[PDB]
Amino acid sequence: MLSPSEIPQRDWFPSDFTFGAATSAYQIEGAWNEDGKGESNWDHFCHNHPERILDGSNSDIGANSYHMYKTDVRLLKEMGMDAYRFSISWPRILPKGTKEGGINPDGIKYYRNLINLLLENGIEPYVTIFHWDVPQALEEKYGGFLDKSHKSIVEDYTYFAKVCFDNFGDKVKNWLTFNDPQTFTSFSYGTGVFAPGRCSPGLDCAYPTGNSLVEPYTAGHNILLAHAEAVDLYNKHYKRDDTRIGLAFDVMGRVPYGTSFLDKQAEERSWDINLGWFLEPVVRGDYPFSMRSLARERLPFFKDEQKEKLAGSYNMLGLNYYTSRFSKNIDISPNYSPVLNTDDAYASQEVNGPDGKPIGPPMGNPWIYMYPEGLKDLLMIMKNKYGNPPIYITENGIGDVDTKETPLPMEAALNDYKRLDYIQRHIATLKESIDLGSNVQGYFAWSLLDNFEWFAGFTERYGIVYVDRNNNCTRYMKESAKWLKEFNTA
Amino acid sequence: MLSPSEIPQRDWFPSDFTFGAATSAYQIEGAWNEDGKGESNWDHFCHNHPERILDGSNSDIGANSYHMYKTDVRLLKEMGMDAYRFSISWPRILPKGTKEGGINPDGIKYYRNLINLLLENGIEPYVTIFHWDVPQALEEKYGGFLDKSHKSIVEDYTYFAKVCFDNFGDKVKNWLTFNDPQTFTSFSYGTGVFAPGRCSPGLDCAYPTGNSLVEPYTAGHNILLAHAEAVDLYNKHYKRDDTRIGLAFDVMGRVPYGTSFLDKQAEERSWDINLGWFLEPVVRGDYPFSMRSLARERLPFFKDEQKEKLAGSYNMLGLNYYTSRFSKNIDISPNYSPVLNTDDAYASQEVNGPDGKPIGPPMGNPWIYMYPEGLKDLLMIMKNKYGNPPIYITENGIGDVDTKETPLPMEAALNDYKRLDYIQRHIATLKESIDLGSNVQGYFAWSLLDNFEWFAGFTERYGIVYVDRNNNCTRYMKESAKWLKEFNTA
Secondary structure, X not given: XXXXXXXOOHHHOOOOOEEEEEOOHHHHOOOOOOOOOOOEHHHHHHHHOHHHOOOOOOOOOOXXXXXXXXXXXXXXXXXXXXXXXXEOXXXXXXXXXXXXXXXXXXXXXXXXXXXHHHHHOOOEEEEEEEOOOOEHHHHHHHOHHHOOOOOHHHHHHHHHHHHHHHHHOOOOOXXXXXXXXXHHHHHHHOXXXXXXXXXXXXXXXXXXXXXXXXXXXXXXXXXXXXXXXXXXXXXHHOOOOOOEEEEEEEEEEEEEOOOOHHHHHHHHHHHHHHXXXXXXXXXXXXXXXXXXXXXXXXXOOOOHXXXXXXXXXXXXXXXXXXXXEEEEEOOOOOOOOOOOHHHHHOEEEEOEOOOOOEOOOEOOOOOOEOOHHHHHHHHHHHHHOOOOOOEEEEEOOOOEEOOOOOOOOHHHHHOOHHHHHHHHHHHHHHHXXXXXXXXXXXXXXXXXXXXXXXXHOOOEEOOOEEEEOOOOOEEEEOHHHXXXXXXXXX | OOOHHHOOOHHHOXXXXXXXXXXXXXXXXXXXXXXXXXXXXXXXXXXXXXXXXXXXXXXXXXXOHHHHHHXXXXXXXXXXXXXXXXXXXXXXXXXXXXXXXXXXXXXXXXXXXXXXXXXXXXXXXXXXXEOOOOEHHHHHHHOHHHOOOOOHHHHHHHHHHHHHHHHHOOOOOEEEEEEOHHHHHHHHHOOOOOOOOEOOOOOOOOEOOOOOOOHHHHHHHHHHHHHHHHHHHXXXXXXXXXXXXXXXXXXXXXXXXXXXXXXXXXXXXXXXXXXXXXXXXXXXXXXXXXXXXXXXXXXXXXXXXXXXXXXXOOOEEEEEEEEEEEEEEOXXXXXXXXXXXXXXXXXXEEOEOOOOOEOOOEOOOOOOEOOXXXXXXXXXXXXXXXXXXXXXXXXXXXXXXXXXXXXXXXXXXXXXXXXXXXXXXXXXXXXXXXXXXXXXXXXXXXXXXXXXXXXXXXXXXXXXXXXXXXXXXXXXXXXXXXXXXXXXXX
């Protein structure tokens, strides 16, 4: 348990530092087929493959934030949050996903009202343009981000961004093109645990007719081109001195498994395939050398023109941090063959070190182990290797397990001391990292609300604010939310 | 240049520290076809392709050390050298390079007498078994180290090794299986400037029908297998508590060209392809990860049993250092295709940094630039990354250019102050390295004598002792030799 002097204080950070909460459209909105909203890959996947969701649920209602946005703002305001990061639903704005399909007026109106209400309450909006919700129309037309041409999806995404810029740009000063590109490509096309659920034949996913060694890279390539093109557009016609744009990467810290220089090299390849994959291209205009030498022809090349648009295509960067892993070396040899795109790193990602102990105490769900040190390591890397750009921890939190077999009593769900302790530690880590020179400028507690958790469905509660789906999605502040309130209010 | 207090003193090093000089058989012996000595790849290359030698010479005479070894020993004694590193001519011991061809008694006689003379004069012999002089018989039989079976050359070398252990093991306490395996493979089969002169079609060498991207690796693989087999034989039947065996690697220091992390990565790949290529296998039993990822199938895999014999196959390691280079990153791209095996590191090795200035002052010939710091970097790498094993700088020196067009007058050749300054600086660097914890135990000035310099023929004088080939290879000490004498006997 942290001691009194170890609990972070708002005044530990500069006056302009940003503290907020975050969410994603498909996870909280609900109203999935309401007011003209088009169907998304996730609507499709959940409805057609409930057996691929842990509890067979879907986000038809989620946290019902489409209808309850005023309450979400009230909660953010009561907590004294400086900002709120949320995402826009592509199919809710462009039901057909394209210009020809037309812009959905109600979709525009919804985010318009949410943005104005936030600003009216002094909360700065950090708008994520895309969070895995691809219009099913594009998915059917050309496989969405699997688009072999590297043109259709890029054009349609760019137009989608243009729509957000045209309608919200006068109000929004912070844009995030993508969120978690690595998890999206690896889970949607590698292990196929995410919509549309594709993987190599022989693997266990809904559609074992893809290629876990190629499709993740194809999609990743399209995401980068889309990002570069959107940023080019924003810069040319929408940017203002006081506005910024970037993207957020999902990243787990990497620590050498053992003492051999071999594990340090494995650790190196691991940061590369996780963070480098999408970060290096926006920083320097191309993928990490490691990945190029290992994925080879399975990793598409950029044109010199694309490298240019990509290099430096951001004013700030988001970092979604939750845990870390020990990276253990795997030699190139006839005995080993990569199966998943992530195997190209030639390193196993271990939870337990050589002493058989976990890298950090388990937080509850199957993958989160508390290791704040990794966040510092990550920040030091951003600082010393990637130009120390403005950083925002766009996601940080834990999931409280709550299953039909082992329900989490409301009272316990509210007394989320483990979550509180975890959040406090990472915030403390940021304070340390800042003193060390890290250009981090904000922290967003992940999940303002308890909501849908993709393949985990509703088996986990990540919110700092409880949502009782049994009672009109009523929100109740958890101890974590209450401390943050005290923190920002102090 | 170096102030009085900066000049190294013998008392700067431990009393057991070793100071010596070195040479190689083909470069100094002469008597290429005397007393039953068989023809070597180098005898063949020089005689058949004199046009591939800068001054069209050969080493039929060299420094005539076969007949003049006695004076070589006297010089070494005069300088108070602790040890003498020389190599054994494979074809002189085994004219047909094999057991069936029989052992040549005169060959055994010569080295046996050199060894006894050295010892009776208190000079420790450090014997290099192979220094590029492959019996032509084996070359014609199966291409020598190009042996596609990875069997014949291995057994023939092992037997050659056995012959050496049998006849000299009782007196020799320090063995070096190979010397400069990287230069040998790269120059003999990559650029083709070394015997037999093979390179990829389209390249300029005597036999542009090889493969500069494959043959260097094949030969390298055979060298490693040969080494492991010889060390295994040695450890099982000849090694005594006071004897040691290893090999020596040629290595240029690598420094990132610019300040980008990309050049640090390039620097990394450069150490790997130059030093790691042969070092990592004898340390851990396999090639560097970088090389396997880049050379791929052109880099043979070791059987588990071979990996076992290779890992830890040495009691000491030799390092042949002369200069360093700035490693500049080269991205993997459809625009770049490796032509030479060395291009596999995706890094250009530059003499001049971004400021257009050379990494170090030019020492005279076309490739040596004085950069003592590079030696320290190398020693620290050995220390912190490769187990800090006993290290002997088995080679270090410079080559005084002496051509027909621009002869080096004897007076100018004897007053080799550039060489003297260069040697004193590297010796100082060893003292600094020892203080940093380096496990270096000795230093060998390269070229006891002025001699044949491979493709450079006699256009360069690397000796600390002048050899007047015009007279009868009469030897005269240079200022460098005189200082070393003062140094050792002070």
